[PDB]
Amino acid sequence: TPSYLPIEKIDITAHTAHNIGDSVWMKNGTFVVASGNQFYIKDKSLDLTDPFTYQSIGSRKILSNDILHLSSVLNGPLPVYHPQFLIQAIYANKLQLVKELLLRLFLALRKLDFESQDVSNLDSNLGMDPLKYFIAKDRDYPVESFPDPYPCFNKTVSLALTEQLTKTTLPYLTRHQQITLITVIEAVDEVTKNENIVDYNGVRFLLGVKLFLSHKNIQKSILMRDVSWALHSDNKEILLSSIDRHITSWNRAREYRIAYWIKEQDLVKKFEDIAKYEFSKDDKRDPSRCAIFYLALKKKQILLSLWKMAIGHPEQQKMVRFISNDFTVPRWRTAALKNAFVLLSKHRYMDAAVFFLLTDSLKDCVNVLCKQVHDMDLAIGVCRVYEGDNGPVLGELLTAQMLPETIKENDRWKASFIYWKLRKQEVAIKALLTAPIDLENNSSIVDKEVCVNRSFLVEDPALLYLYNHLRNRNLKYFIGSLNVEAKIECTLILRVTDILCRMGCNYLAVSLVKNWKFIE
Amino acid sequence: SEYGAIYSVSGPVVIAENMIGCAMYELVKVGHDNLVGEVIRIDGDKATIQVYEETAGLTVGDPVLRTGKPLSVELGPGLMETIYDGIQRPLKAIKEESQSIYIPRGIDTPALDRTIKWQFTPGKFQVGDHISGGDIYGSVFENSLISSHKILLPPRS
């Protein structure tokens, strides 16, 4: 969205051809305009026929029709039920608080309906005590109870809320924001079920994917934020089993970026299943598609059998006669390399990667997968299943193909992931705070002026919440240097606030500054 | 050795003996003038050659040198705006070198001018990248009409 949005076009020209003489705001938004000896004082109300006012107000509902009130709706603290506040209170370790706010929202809506009062009377803070937002830790939250008919947030309250939110239009919320609020209710319902199993980097990932499902129109794969939430979770098995139902095809194992974070011991099984599916696609049986998954696993024999049973395919006779050889033989190794480089010139990139993997030249299979096929997701998967979980070919691939673009794009999620897969944990944790161009002589990769800068560098509060997690688990790497680390923690805390404040979550900014623990 | 001997000569056809270990369509230098010819048939140690020059004066017993290569064409900058002698040798350079109005028998002249400096500019490939046959790894300015002569990797490289 633009940082500024027009809300009125005071068109004095519609009455006189004389140019505006002078313009001056005054008390309560009164905008006095002068021309000749003749003033055009406009009050702070709004004319809904204007295209600017109509577009800025959008679908919202506002108590007063004012430029002052409108400018206090498009900006300023969020109502505590706003979806952008609830997801940000979930990313911060305040899930219990979000559950309580949803319960209070239900109670307030029932109160309004029972008294037949208009919903616009709904309290923005839902009668919450502000100190609740400042509680340092999720398990220290005083989760009080309510009267018997609905004592604590649960499935019944969830369904009642999802009904009410369709039977009423919450104030200040564009209908799309209300849809995302309903999806947040569903996500909290899911988390409450899994809340007893997955640590809280599992809860953040679960909400990330549940929000992804509602935005497949504009979002083509879970952000690297969610991949990094899951990558550092201790319960990757639970997350994978929760999103498994959606991973039927490779195109859906590439949306959830499973190759990045799922455990190698599950990535092997997922390649087996994805090979099964990719073979028996909608069209017909074709061992060409599932070749890479079966070779990466080192199951050339299954691929050979697959080619054999594919009697109808035109390529069958050549491939059965070729693949059956033993590619430890130098002559056949060179023959397979030659065929791989021929297929790279006949524009058959996937087959070139397959052949480059027959001979165990992984460094050439993964470079054909990430550079000519454009699947870094599949390259990482093949690296992780074929050779091992972390490096050595994966390290070179990431440092060559991903690190430069990450530095140019100034992306710190990718940089942290890369320095994690290189098992450079001590600097992988630091890459979350300091920009990639300043890490490990990365300035040698690209000139500092080529990198993105200016307003495009919008912070990401979650990026800090991850650090405070890793920083606390990997203290061994931070005891050696405290003053230098604090010098940048105290900068990124004040730069993460001032976006938590610019995105309306002031209550979370105060919590972040209040509760941050400096490692003395 | 690589030297067979002329056994028979008839018109453009030279049958050479001691040519065991000779490949089909292999170029050969026939005679002392080193006339270029191609082995068209092989029969034991006898290889039949089609000579691409005038065979007048070829003697029985004259050496026939294997070249190990087929009749090849040089492909690269300096190929447009040129006229060639059936085989890939250039007529203008032939005239400039022999300084005569005829085409000397067995004259050897590189097909493409090897003294012209061509303004190479590399393409989209870098070190560590994989290149296969046909990949345009650069271009040179050949002339105002052909302003970018693509430099392709050989088809079998």
Side-chain angles (χ1 to χ4, degrees), chain A residues 1-21 23-46 48 50-58 60-112 114-139 141-142 144-162 164-168 170-194 196-213 215-216 219-264 266-282 286-310 312-325 327-359 362-395 397-404 406-407 410-425 427-447 449-452 458-475 477-478 480 482 484-519, chain B:
Chain A
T1 57
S3 186
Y4 284 65
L5 198 75
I7 56 174
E8 277 208 288
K9 178 184 179 179
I10 300 179
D11 211 54
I12 293 153
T13 181
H15 311 119
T16 50
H18 289 208
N19 314 300
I20 288 173
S23 299
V24 67
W25 286 94
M26 293 177 70
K27 214 181 62 180
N28 297 355
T30 300
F31 181 62
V32 165
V33 185
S35 65
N37 75 321
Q38 159 178 106
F39 299 163
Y40 286 82
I41 304 102
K42 206 187 77 68
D43 183 41
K44 62 161 173 173
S45 48
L46 285 162
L48 302 152
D50 181 316
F52 292 116
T53 301
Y54 163 52
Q55 291 154 218
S56 63
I57 298 173
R60 301 173 198 269
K61 305 190 79 171
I62 66 181
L63 276 54
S64 290
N65 205 0
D66 278 1
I67 54 172
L68 284 194
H69 183 274
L70 175 57
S71 64
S72 192
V73 165
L74 302 193
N75 175 44
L78 281 180
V80 309
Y81 49 82
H82 200 279
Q84 192 183 229
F85 184 102
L86 300 182
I87 65 171
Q88 283 290 347
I90 283 167
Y91 285 171
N93 208 22
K94 313 188 188 305
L95 176 67
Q96 304 313 301
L97 186 139
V98 170
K99 295 197 303 179
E100 186 184 330
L101 277 70
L102 296 173
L103 175 56
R104 286 177 181 272
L105 178 65
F106 174 62
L107 298 183
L109 291 173
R110 272 212 312 106
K111 204 92 75 184
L112 295 162
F114 182 76
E115 296 188 338
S116 198
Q117 299 205 50
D118 189 72
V119 66
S120 311
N121 303 356
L122 173 60
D123 181 10
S124 285
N125 294 77
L126 307 173
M128 271 285 308
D129 181 357
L131 283 71
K132 296 295 202 70
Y133 304 95
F134 307 170
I135 302 298
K137 206 172 286 292
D138 201 42
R139 64 191 161 51
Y141 190 64
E144 65 187 88
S145 179
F146 293 69
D148 65 81
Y150 299 97
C152 65
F153 191 85
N154 57 43
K155 270 299 307 186
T156 74
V157 180
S158 176
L159 277 296
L161 264 166
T162 303
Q164 288 177 344
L165 270 50
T166 65
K167 262 62 151 193
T168 61
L170 283 167
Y172 313 139
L173 272 66
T174 60
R175 304 304 102 201
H176 181 277
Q177 286 167 2
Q178 194 162 322
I179 300 163
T180 64
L181 170 52
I182 286 166
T183 69
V184 168
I185 310 312
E186 294 177 16
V188 175
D189 195 6
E190 180 166 69
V191 171
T192 43
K193 173 175 180 291
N194 286 101
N196 306 119
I197 312 171
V198 297
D199 60 351
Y200 204 63
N201 293 245
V203 169
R204 301 175 174 140
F205 172 77
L206 262 66
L207 187 148
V209 303
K210 272 294 301 186
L211 260 66
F212 161 53
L213 294 172
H215 287 81
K216 284 214 202 55
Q219 200 192 102
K220 304 272 281 153
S221 63
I222 60 174
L223 305 180
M224 191 55 88
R225 185 168 66 231
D226 313 300
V227 169
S228 57
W229 289 131
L231 166 54
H232 296 99
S233 178
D234 295 337
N235 306 107
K236 300 172 180 83
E237 308 94 350
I238 313 304
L239 319 183
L240 181 55
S241 63
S242 87
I243 62 162
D244 214 356
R245 60 176 48 71
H246 313 292
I247 295 152
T248 58
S249 170
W250 174 249
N251 288 317
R252 287 209 166 223
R254 179 150 47 82
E255 278 182 4
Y256 296 97
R257 292 179 154 158
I258 69 175
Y260 287 65
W261 55 269
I262 78 178
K263 278 186 176 178
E264 183 211 326
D266 291 331
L267 187 62
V268 164
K269 282 59 151 183
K270 290 312 304 176
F271 276 177
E272 290 179 355
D273 304 346
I274 291 158
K276 304 304 178 64
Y277 183 94
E278 288 282 87
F279 175 25
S280 66
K281 206 59 164 282
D282 299 350
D286 184 354
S288 168
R289 299 192 298 277
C290 78
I292 184 60
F293 303 105
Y294 273 117
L295 293 190
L297 293 164
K298 313 187 182 181
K299 283 195 170 186
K300 177 174 77 80
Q301 309 299 354
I302 304 300
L303 183 58
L304 181 64
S305 307
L306 265 295
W307 266 121
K308 285 177 180 283
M309 51 145 278
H313 202 281
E315 286 285 359
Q316 187 263 338
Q317 189 56 84
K318 303 155 58 181
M319 301 295 218
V320 174
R321 183 165 58 219
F322 185 88
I323 295 171
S324 56
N325 298 284
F327 290 97
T328 57
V329 179
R331 160 184 193 292
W332 283 115
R333 193 176 191 283
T334 301
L337 295 176
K338 278 186 157 81
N339 280 285
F341 273 113
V342 166
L343 287 158
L344 214 63
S345 76
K346 314 221 80 189
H347 294 127
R348 291 174 64 181
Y349 297 116
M350 180 54 49
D351 300 326
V354 173
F355 274 75
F356 274 132
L357 200 52
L358 272 170
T359 74
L362 174 69
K363 317 97 208 69
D364 314 300
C365 170
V366 305
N367 270 308
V368 165
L369 284 169
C370 63
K371 288 183 183 165
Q372 274 130 115
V373 178
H374 304 294
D375 269 2
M376 192 76 207
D377 303 278
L378 183 49
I380 298 160
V382 166
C383 291
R384 290 184 69 228
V385 176
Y386 193 93
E387 54 160 20
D389 191 17
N390 279 330
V393 172
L394 177 53
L397 162 66
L398 289 170
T399 314
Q401 298 301 122
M402 187 182 285
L403 191 53
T406 287
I407 291 160
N410 210 331
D411 186 328
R412 281 172 272 161
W413 294 114
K414 279 184 184 273
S416 178
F417 162 81
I418 290 168
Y419 289 116
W420 202 260
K421 305 316 289 172
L422 297 163
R423 69 182 85 205
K424 294 191 140 292
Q425 314 198 335
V427 63
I429 296 169
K430 295 184 199 296
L432 299 165
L433 277 296
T434 181
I437 186 61
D438 305 331
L439 296 165
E440 287 269 291
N441 65 26
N442 282 335
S443 165
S444 300
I445 299 292
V446 301
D447 187 13
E449 294 193 330
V450 183
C451 310
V452 166
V458 186
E459 273 291 327
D460 192 347
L463 183 63
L464 188 69
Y465 303 145
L466 184 61
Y467 170 88
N468 187 16
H469 172 258
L470 303 182
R471 194 269 309 272
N472 290 352
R473 293 209 302 179
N474 303 270
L475 283 166
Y477 312 137
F478 287 75
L482 306 175
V484 172
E485 296 304 332
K487 184 62 221 73
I488 187 156
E489 288 180 10
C490 185
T491 291
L492 264 289
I493 294 163
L494 303 175
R495 185 130 42 80
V496 161
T497 67
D498 186 74
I499 68 159
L500 285 172
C501 307
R502 286 206 297 93
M503 74 167 57
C505 309
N506 305 52
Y507 275 120
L508 314 184
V510 298
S511 163
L512 162 56
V513 294
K514 186 262 195 179
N515 306 115
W516 189 262
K517 288 296 190 178
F518 286 93
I519 182 60
Chain B
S1 183
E2 279 197 298
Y3 285 161
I6 290 182
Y7 175 68
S8 159
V9 185
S10 185
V13 185
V14 166
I15 290 190
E17 69 202 328
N18 305 135
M19 292 291 279
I20 190 167
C22 178
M24 290 290 289
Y25 304 120
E26 190 200 61
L27 276 195
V28 281
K29 305 301 181 73
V30 184
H32 307 288
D33 290 352
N34 291 302
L35 310 187
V36 171
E38 221 176 8
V39 170
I40 61 179
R41 281 75 178 273
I42 292 283
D43 295 328
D45 79 335
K46 286 204 196 292
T48 312
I49 292 148
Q50 75 185 2
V51 186
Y52 292 131
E53 312 239 33
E54 185 66 9
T55 49
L58 284 183
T59 294
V60 167
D62 267 2
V64 182
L65 166 82
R66 292 180 179 90
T67 66
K69 310 163 186 178
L71 177 64
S72 291
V73 66
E74 288 174 44
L75 304 169
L79 203 60
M80 294 298 102
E81 211 186 336
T82 300
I83 182 174
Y84 289 111
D85 188 358
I87 54 171
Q88 183 52 3
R89 58 185 183 195
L91 292 176
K92 169 169 165 62
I94 279 167
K95 169 147 166 60
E96 267 150 25
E97 292 164 358
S98 72
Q99 296 294 321
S100 78
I101 61 177
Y102 305 108
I103 298 148
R105 289 183 195 158
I107 184 159
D108 215 338
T109 305
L112 303 173
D113 195 349
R114 267 141 181 73
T115 63
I116 293 174
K117 284 263 197 184
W118 301 101
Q119 183 62 59
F120 179 73
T121 62
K124 66 182 181 180
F125 292 74
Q126 293 82 17
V127 173
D129 286 5
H130 279 131
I131 201 165
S132 37
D135 285 10
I136 302 158
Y137 62 82
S139 72
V140 310
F141 174 90
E142 189 168 31
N143 59 56
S144 176
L145 200 173
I146 313 296
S147 58
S148 54
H149 186 112
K150 300 312 192 285
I151 307 304
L152 339 169
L153 203 80
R156 291 177 176 175
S157 277

